[PDB]
Subunit: 252 residues, 7 copies
């Protein structure tokens, strides 16, 4: 774009790490302060790296003939900001890209899409939802999968199994590396501030989220049928981090 | 092109952000002022970044047997200028590219095309129209899709469904990331000015647009038939941004 | 080429913009003056950017049973020069490329080709003619398409239609982005001048052209048959731009 | 990401090599100390090169009609840290990537995956598990392969063989070059420390591991049936390496 | 190659342009003089750019039942040198490349080949012959194409046509862009001269040529049969250009 | 890796060439000495280039009805080191890569693998074994190929041949260029030494090897049956090269 | 390789051109002298550019019913050196690459191979032999092609032809551009010399060669049968060039 039209400062960085031991959600708020004499506004490029655990474990089981699985079905990152504050979000990467395909029809569908919720001048939010995953190398099953006899086959290790339900669940490692051992949101977003702002200080509200699912699964005496109730439990890790743009620094 | 024929300044930048809370449309007019001693004219490379929301919501419903959906079917960006003013649009990116294919025939058709309306020396306009989208992994349906029995299948979640029409609509996330959570135009265009212009000041009219569509859908007691009336409602976010080329700055 | 044989100045630029409001034909003559002490001749790299309108509109119609369509089928750019003047065209981009294919046979055929008419030492001219376009996702129809019953299917929206001929024409946006909203020729060419030339001044003739075609289409009471007469109307935007090689500047 | 948003010190490295002759596990802990005036925290990029041997050998056998094979089915690298210590792991490469495929369905499956276990602010750990491998160019067999008649065909050189079981095992070189002559982890992870930390010294717990498998295989007088007991033997190699951030050096 | 073995001046340029108005053969002799202290011999990289017209026109016709077509089938550029002169040709780009294919068999075959005739220490010459071209999207016909009933189908617009032979020939634009509007050679060659040569002057003979072919085509009262006699007419544009290596300049 | 975490001296080389005329094994030990102030240990990057001949010749024959072929099956290169010496091998290139394929199953298999035997802190060893080769464009035969009637078809030029066994062997050039005219090992390995080592001198044991194969082939009066006994003859070229890290030099 | 292990002078060139007018064998011996203070030995990179003619002509014929064709089937470049001299060849480019393919089986096979005969410390020699070529777009015929009825189909223009054998041979241009107008070797090899060598001078023996083949072809009164006797004629072009490493120059 730059060369198509024949067209040809000290930055302060830092990092803040915190860990929610109860939820096991890693946090990473890497940042860099940018000031430009030509630019009429101050800058701060926020890197939203880190990781959110998978916690693909059997939370409990109702005996050997019925068991449930607590696993994550949608991750999110929503760097929301109070509307009272005058801090402006300028740009954010990645940006929702136009879908592409070929025409018989074919296209690429990643298991964990990377969508970006319609932001505003205050709140910027993603949603790394679960599209579909393949079990037993047979069909990319999604959350909506359901069968009259087999029920949901989201993680059914064996159709006509004879083991304990808490032990006959699909191996976490045979599936993707996002549920078994977590997903690592590595996103970014820049916020700009007035050059002649009175208060060179706002509040950054970092809110990591995820959508755990309760996948109750039981034997119908002929095959294993499971039911999944979306958003059975949700875990949020809110956190407020204050900046000092006068000193070009943000701390816990 | 440059090397094919054996051929081998201080720039002022800035950014202006505004938000239409009623229409929920982000605005972004990032820019840079370029002046060259060799060039005989002044420059201003205008970046047209930002985002226009989708607002893919059930605006109203006529009970459970008939409902309508308000969703966007065409986005636009038209940086128009009054014909009285002498500001000249020189070049703009992207430029309408020549279609290509292979010959049986195959080609690539993005869901949201990026067309450029025939500009002039005053107004430059694009139109990111909706080409076609795939529902239930079966056919890239377009706005013109219609069936004698099934009607339009643009967002019919279930053909022979039995749920409420306001609840049996296709999931926003299963479709593209443009309708559900907005589309983010990232365009550019340069306007050049006379070196010896008497008044180093004009008015930039940024007009973000979009075409919401009313898609009424109802059960025919056998299957769901929907009808879409194009351009039922349109939303425009016009705004005038005055420049100071003498100071090489543009403000709200 | 350079490295295959083991082998390892101030330039004045500018731009001239003009617009033909009658024909809607944008003009752009971006340029740069190059002088090299090692080179024995002066240089001027002329860039032929800009755009030519499509004007894909129903110019008139003979009622609802017969209509004609005014659309462009061949654009051109011919930077000609009077033979009296001693200005020499040295090189021009693009240059006619050798066709390639694979051998069953397959190759790529663009909708709007970019041919280069056999130039001379005075006149250099391309011709962006129309090769073929696909309608209703069925066959890449060309100007020569004709059927005994259906006639020409170049822009027939519906074969056995029942709407008005002025309203039952193919949507401009469903076709390519060249006829509907214009095509943007971005060409280039360098002319070199004698180092010891007596008069450091010539006349550059920029002639943007186009060939509108009359696509008369009518209902045969069974299906819509259309006829196209090539070169029914042509529009030229000639313009002379004088150079000052002594000052290394060209003005209107 | 950096350029999408229009945005445009002395480091001390070192070396520490040790070798466990009993288990034959090579170790390499290449590193570099980074300090930045703009950054508010100290840095240390730890590289986890080296190799873990394969030891694809017949540990013992029960006559010629029954034999077992000791071969590695999962490697690991777990740079853990005591929770008492305040040393913070910031980022780690590689990061679990989102799975990709095309839709008939197709995707790529490496034999030795590279998963990353859900870490915390103290412990970072991989798990290079075995996905699936192909024998006799017929099917990518995995650890879970089992047949009622042929048993497990994981390394069965000949189905209806007649040689000694300790001599009729699949050649180590015909399979991948990981089991036969070892797998070489080349991973990394960076740890950050407080700029005003009282004690500039922590303890790096490098624990190389692996999961050797006992593959008992015997002749059923008609064909060879084998049974593999996962995690039959494990060979951890713990090690503590102390750092001196005040001197920016780490030693054994 | 250079880095595979672990291994890591003022140049005078210029150009000479001339045109043959009778034959329409453009000439371009772009060059550069290179002298190196480490090199023991002088250098001159001669670039053989330019264009040779196609003149794909009906030179004459024998009424409407028989016509001939004057079209070029072999272009050449032979920078020959008298054997008396000691000017040495060292290297020349392009150099004949080894053919490649895949094994069913497939490969790429350009329409207009670029062969390099076996040169010597004095004479260097290419030959841009015609390989094959496709008509009516049916078969890549070559010069040797011949049929007992249809004759040569090289440029037969319609097999069982009824139009005038001077008007029922294949459109020049539907075929390749080489015969219709000329072919533009972009060649090069470097000649080296003795550092202690007594006479720093030789004679460069640039000879652009062409081999026009007569394609007589007539109606056999059932279909159009044509015959092509190779090398019917040839046109040569010889030219001698003297060098001044002492001044490192070459002029007309 | 480096840029994924937002992270941004005099070297003495040399040469040592020797040749074993009896075995025809060329040797090249290109190297470079590296010392870094930030590094706590010295470095030496040893390059294992050179070439080992193929000697694909008929060593002897038992008349015309039975013959043997001496052709190579492995080119081992084992730079070993005595365990008494404290010279440490840190890293070595190439490092065994994880296999890749697509899932019907497909993958790539080179004829001459480049395996890396499980090394230690003293010894680093490769083994360029033969995977499989294709004869008569029919099947990638390996050393394990055997047929009840045709025997081994490894280099059987003609199945039902009638020529002399010493003359009816497959042409060396029709197979790969490795057996016929040698394989050229171009490998490397870096060794590090203590900065405060008392003795700055060790011994590099370069041992070029090879595993010739005896391919006895005879006519069974109906077809040619051959037998190959692996490791029939092996040839070694041991050599000791002493380093002087104090002078940063290594000689024969 | 270099960066995989975390690791980050005046040169005299020249020219020497000679030509064998009898055999038409061009010669080019481009070179560069390299001396490094860190290197313990001197260097000289010899480039083997130039070209060898093809001479694909009818040397003689036996009437119109039998003819022979003198065409080259193997070119060679053997930079041999006397064993008495201590000039050491260290490395040479290209070096034989390991074959690759995919597994049904597929791979790439060049028409004109570029083999490298097993060299030594004195002699380095290639052999540009002919692999296979395709005639009439039907089968990649090789020198070994033979048929009981049609004989050898290597250059048989027409199977059941009726023209003169001296005139019914395949066109030289329809085949590859290597036999017709020569093959152009572009090889290289570096030789290293002792830094403290007493005599800084050796003898470089450049020997261009070729292996012409006599392809007799005659009509069997039903079809043309051809026979090719390999290595019928060879035309060696020996040449010795002396170096002066003390002056870092090599001349004729």
């Amino acid at each position: 774009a730059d060369s198509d039209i024949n067209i040809k400062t000290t930055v302060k960085t830092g990092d803040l790490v915190t860990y929610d031991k109860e939820n096991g959600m890693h946090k990473k708020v890497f940042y860099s302060f940018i000031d430009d004499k030509n630019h009429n506004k101050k800058l701060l490029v926020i890197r939203t790296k880190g990781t959110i655990a998978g916690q693909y474990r059997v939370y409990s089981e109702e005996g050997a003939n019925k068991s449930g699985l607590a696993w994550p079905s949608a991750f999110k990152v929503q760097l929301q900001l109070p509307d009272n504050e005058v801090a402006q979000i300028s740009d954010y990467y990645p940006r929702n890209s136009i879908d592409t395909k070929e025409y018989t029809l074919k296209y690429v569908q990643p298991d964990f899409k990377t969508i970006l919720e319609s932001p505003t001048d205050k709140k910027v939010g993603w949603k790394v939802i679960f599209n579909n995953m393949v079990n037993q190398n047979w069909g990319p099953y999604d959350r909506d999968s359901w069968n009259p006899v087999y029920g949901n086959q989201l993680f059914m290790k064996t159709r006509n199994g004879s083991m304990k339900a808490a032990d006959n669940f699909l191996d976490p490692n045979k599936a993707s590396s996002l549920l078994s051992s977590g997903f690592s949101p590595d996103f970014a977003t820049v916020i700009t501030m007035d050059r002649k702002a009175s208060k060179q200080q706002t509040n950054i509200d970092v809110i990591y989220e995820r959508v755990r699912d309760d996948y109750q699964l039981h034997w119908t005496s002929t095959n294993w049928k499971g039911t999944n109730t979306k958003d059975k439990w949700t875990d949020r890790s809110s956190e407020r981090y204050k900046i000092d743009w006068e000193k070009e620094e943000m701390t816990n």
